[PDB]
Design a protein around this nucleic acid. Structure first.
Length: 71
RNA sequence: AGAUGGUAAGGGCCCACGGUGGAUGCCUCGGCACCCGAGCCGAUGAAGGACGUGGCUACCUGCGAUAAGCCAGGGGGAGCCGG
């Protein structure tokens, strides 16, 4: 998954500021559905939940990076 | 008529044998002095907190709605996802 964390980075860092904001919004919705039903009982699966947080993070990080409009 | 021993409800002293009780000896993640270096934090919001945060978490610690955590660079070399 490491080179896929790098898939996130190298293929979502390099994909527009505006579309990035929209990206992480979608991501938010995703995790919402996750934690949501994962609680409701059956199909309660772990892992991915935390991962999504991790995912979220990098996006926003790099978001602010190029959203600090500096390089 | 004379004789002079005698059992123990319970007790004392004594020994072995237990229970409580923590001594002492030894142990040291902590403590003690001194010696050397080091020595400012804050409006960039400090020292210090409240609440929260983990799939399941009561406390401790860790972080901060990007919550037991993200990015880049360096270390290092088989293990890791806190106690």
């Amino acid at each position: 998954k490491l080179s896929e964390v790098r898939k996130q980075l190298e293929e979502a860092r390099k994909l527009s500021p505006v579309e990035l904001e929209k990206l992480v919004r979608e991501k938010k919705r995703e995790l919402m559905e996750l934690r949501f039903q994962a609680s409701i009982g059956q199909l309660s699966q772990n892992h991915k939940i935390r991962d999504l947080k991790r995912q979220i993070a990098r996006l926003l990080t790099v978001l602010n990076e190029k959203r600090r409009q500096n390089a």
